[PDB]
Amino acid sequence: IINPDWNFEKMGIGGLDKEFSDIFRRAFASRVFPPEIVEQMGCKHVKGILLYGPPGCGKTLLARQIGKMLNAREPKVVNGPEILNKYVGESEANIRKLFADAEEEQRRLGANSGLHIIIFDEIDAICKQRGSMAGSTGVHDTVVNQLLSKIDGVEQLNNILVIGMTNRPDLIDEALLRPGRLEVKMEIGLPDEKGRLQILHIHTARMRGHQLLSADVDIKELAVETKNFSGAELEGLVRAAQSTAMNRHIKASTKVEVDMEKAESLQVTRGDFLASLENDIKPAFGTNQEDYASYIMNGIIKWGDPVTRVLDDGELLVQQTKNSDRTPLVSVLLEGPPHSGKTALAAKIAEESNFPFIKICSPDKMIGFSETAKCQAMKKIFDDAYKSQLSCVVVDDIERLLDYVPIGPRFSNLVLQALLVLLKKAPPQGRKLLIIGTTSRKDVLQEMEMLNAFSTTIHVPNIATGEQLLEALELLGNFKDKERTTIAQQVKGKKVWIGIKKLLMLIEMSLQMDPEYRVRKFLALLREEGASP
C-alpha cells in the first residue's frame, strides 16, 4: 500500500528520516510483500513495538504517521495514569474496554478485517517492578496480567497492533518483552544540527509564504546557537519571537504616529529572536547561565599564585576528559579549610569548560527530604547527564549530603552507598563525563574509604602573609592611602590565617562607623580572629 522506498518529508516529521527505514526494515516486512507469497509461506505478523527516549522528542508524531501510512482506522489514544482506580477490579475493566471493537470486527468479517492500532502512553505506570525500589506502588499486579491475556492466550486476535511509549526503559516488566509480545525496541534521541535546521525550516513555512518575515533573519545562525534543544523548545522560540515582535511593534506604533506604510508591515526582524532566545526559552537539557550568578556573587580576584595553579589544573583535567580514549570517566576532589572559597572556584572551572550540559546538585534544594528522596534526586540528575555527548555535574557539599555530626558519629548509609556506586559507573559507549567534588573535612572522607574512589586532589589554601592581605585589600579597593599605611605598619606581625569570606564580612562590619575609628575597629576584629596554624 506504500511505495517501495516510502516517503517522509515536509509532512511534519522532519528530523527522523533514518528511523522510518530502520523500523520498516526490521519489523514490517510482511505487510508489504504481495499477499499470495505471504499466505504461501504461512507466517504471522508482529503484534506490537516499543519506543523510549527523552520527553518532548517527537514520539507521538512517529506513531501517528506510522499508523497513517499502513491504512489503519482511527487510533484509539489513551493515557497511563488515567487508567487507574482505587475500587477493586475496576482497572481491569478499563483495560478490557479497549479491544471491544477489534473483537466485534473479527467476529463479523472473519479474516478480512482491517487493522486497528492502540497507542498507549507512559506504559511504565502499570508495572509490578516499580515496587522493588523504595516506596509502595504495587499497582495491584493483577492489572498487567489482564493485558497479557488480551495480546495472546486461548482466544487469538489476528488484526491488532500495539505501540507502546515510555520514558524509563528500566521499569518495564520483564514478562512484557518475550517473543510473541512487544518485541522490537527503538531509541529516539536528541536531534543534531541538521535536525534543528530541518525543524526550523518546517515550523517557519507560514511566515515565509506571505513574505511577512524579514530578510535580516537567518536560520543557520539560530540552528548553531541552539545546542541541546529538542523540538518543543524550538517551537517555543518561534512562538515567543512572534509574540514579542507583535507587542513591541504595536507599542512603538502607538508611541510614534508612523505612516501606514510601516504600520502595515509587521516584520519580526532578528532582534526579537535573540531577545526571546536569551530571555524567554529555558532549555532543560542545556546550560543554565542564571545559576552561575547565584554562586559567584563578587567575582574572582587574584591575590596570589594558588588561584592560577588551581585554574590551570582544572583546564588540564577538562582537556584530558574531552579528547581521550580508554578513560571516559574522570573525577576530582577539592579540599580545604572552611571559608576558603571552594564553591566559586568549582563553578568557574565548570563554566570555563564550554561543555553543552552543565549541572549543579546542591543540598540547598533538599530541605526536609528523607534519604530516599535524596537518592532519587541524585539518580535523576545523573540519568539526565547520561543522555548527552559531553556533560559535567557538580556536587556542592559532600558533608551535608551525608548528614554528618561529630557526636556519635551519625550519618545515612544509603546515600553513601549510592554515591560510591555512582562514582564508578561509566556511561554508555561513546560518551564522556566529568565530576567535581567539594568538602572541608578530608580526614573523615579518607577514613570512610571514599578517597579511594576519586582520581585526584587539589588544595585551596588561605591568606598566610601580610603582603597578600595588602594586595587583597588593594584589589578590593576600600581603604585610603594613610589608612593602608597604618594597616601595613601594624600587620607585619605575621601569623595571619583568615578566609576570604570572613575577610569580606570583617571589612563590611568595620565599615559601619565614621572614617576616624575604622582602622582600630578593623584591627581589633582581626586580632580576636587571629588564630595560628
Ligand X SMILES: Nc1ncnc2c1ncn2[C@@H]1O[C@H](COP(=O)(O)OP(=O)(O)O)[C@@H](O)[C@H]1O
Binding site listing? 298-303, 338-345
* Least distance (Å) between residue 101 CB and a second copy: 39
Q: 397, 486, 502, 521: which one is catalytic?
A: 397
Residues 223-262 that bind ligand X (CB under 6 A): 231-232, 235
Contact between 501 and ligand ATP per CB under 6 A: yes
**Shortest spacing between CB 523 and ligand ATP, in angstroms:** 22
**Nearer to a second copy (CB atom), residue 151 or residue 453:** 453
Instruction: Compute how many other C-beta atoms are within 10 angstroms of the C-beta atom of residue 219.
Output: 12
Give the residue nearest to ligand ATP (CB): 341
Q: Is 187 in the site for a second copy (CB under 8 A)?
A: no
The one of ligand ATP, ligand X, a second copy, none whose footprint includes residue 58, by CB under 5 to 8 A per kind, is: ligand X
The reply to whether 42 sits near ligand X by the rule CB under 6 A is no
Site for a second copy in 122-181 (CB under 8 A): 132-134
**Interface residues for ligand ATP in 430-449 (CB under 6 A)?**
440
C-alpha cell at 419: 554515591
Tell me if 78 contacts ligand X by CB under 6 A.
no
Q: How far apart are the first and last CA of the chain?
A: 83
Task: State yes or no: residue 50 binds ligand X (CB under 6 A).
Answer: no
Residue 86 bears catalytic tag = no
Min dist CB 344 to a second copy, Å, is 14
φ, ψ of residue 369 to 5 degrees: the values are: -65, 140
* Sequence letter at residue 348: K
Q: How far apart are alpha carbons 165 and 145 in whole angstroms? A: 19
Residues tagged in the binding site annotation for Mg(2+): 343
Q: Residue 347: left (phi > 0), alpha (psi -120 to 50), or beta? A: alpha
Q: What is the DSSP string of 24-41?
A: HHHT-STTTS-HHHHHHH
Is residue 228 within 8 Å of 285, Cβ to Cβ? yes
Q: At what angle do helices 518-528 and 500-510 cross, to 10 degrees?
A: 140
C-alpha cell at 86: 482505587
Q: Is 344 in the site for ligand ATP (CB under 6 A)?
A: yes
C-alpha cell at 398: 559532600
Site string for ligand ATP, 285-304 (x = CB under 6 A): -----------xxxxxx---
Q: Give the cell for residue 310.
A: 588551581
Give me the residue whose beta carbon is nearest to ligand X: 58
Question: Considering only residues 4, 35, 42, 55, which one is a binding residue for ligand X as defined by CB under 6 A?
Answer: 55
CA dist 251 and 117 (Å) reads 50
> 76-77 and 458-459: which strand pairing?
unpaired
Q: Is residue 340 close enough to count as binding ligand ATP by CB under 6 A?
A: yes
Catalytic pick from 47, 185, 501, 502? 501
Strands of 116-119's sheet in order across: 49-52, 160-166, 116-119, 76-77
Task: Give the residue numbers annotated as catalytic, written as ranges.
Answer: 342-343, 396-397, 424, 501
Binding site residues, ligand X, CB under 6 A: 13-15, 55-61, 199, 202, 231-232, 235
